[PDB]
Amino acid sequence: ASTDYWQNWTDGGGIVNAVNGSGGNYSVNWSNTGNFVVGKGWTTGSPFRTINYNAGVWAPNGNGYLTLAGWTRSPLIQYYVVDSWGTYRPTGTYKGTVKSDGGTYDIYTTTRYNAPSIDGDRTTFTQYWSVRQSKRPTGSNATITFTNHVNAWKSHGMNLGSNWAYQVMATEGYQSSGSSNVTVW
């Protein structure tokens, strides 16, 4: 299935100029921001989906992630598969590693308290991460075989919720400027 979801959230800090391009294409140009998440993908995430993308521009200046990003409810979990980043490589409680799509990823968990989620301004949730041990080259067609992540996570006690929300290939930033241009299919 083609992408059917456009994610465009900013906490309102700085400038986040997001363009919803044709098909699965988007771009972001941002300046001195708070937190934001922009991307294209699917209204309902699947654990069996292979996400394809091509990041024609990946130019964070400061903290930004180029990442699969999604949520589940029941329970409320946010998840990431981080392929590249800027000045900050996100880490947490180390769980193990997983190999997928030509890369090796570290597996981490973190928890957020009284923080914004898909359920409100001030909620508590767990975050599951696969973070690539080195930045993935950008500019060619790339794949995230998400089932590999889901399976590794499960084997390390990290179960996703039963009610799947959005699933996008995102540009996320915090306290940064930058430019990205990504197509997703």
Ligand X SMILES: O[C@@H]1[C@@H](O)[C@H](O[C@@H]2CO[C@@H](O[C@@H]3CO[C@@H](O)[C@H](O)[C@H]3O)[C@H](O)[C@H]2O)OC[C@H]1O
Q: What are 4's two structure tokens?
A: 């059917």
Interface positions, 43-82, toward ligand X (CB under 6 A): 54, 56-57
**Residue choice 56, 92, 96, 103 for contact with Zn ion (CB under 5 A):** 96
Q: What are 160's two structure tokens?
A: 């996703």
Give yes or no for a contact between 77 and 161, defined as CB atoms under 8 angstroms apart: yes
Residue 112 interacts with ligand X (CB under 6 A): yes or no:
yes
Residue 116 interacts with ligand X (CB under 6 A): yes or no:
yes
The amino acid that residue 45 corresponds to is G
Residue 161 interacts with Zn ion (CB under 5 A): yes or no:
no
Nearest residue to Zn ion by CB is 96
3-class secondary-structure state, position 164: strand
Partner whose binding site includes residue 5, from ligand X, Zn ion, none (CB under 5 to 8 Å by kind) = none
Residue 118 interacts with ligand X (CB under 6 A): yes or no:
yes
Whole-angstrom distance, CA of residue 37 vs CA of residue 18: 10
Q: What are 35's two structure tokens?
A: 């937190």
Partner whose binding site includes residue 110, from ligand X, Zn ion, none (CB under 5 to 8 Å by kind) = none
Nearest Cα to Cα of residue 122 among 64, 76, 168, 90: 76
Catalog residues that contact ligand X under the rule CB under 6 A: 7, 9, 35, 37, 54, 56-57, 112, 115-118, 141, 172, 181-183, 185
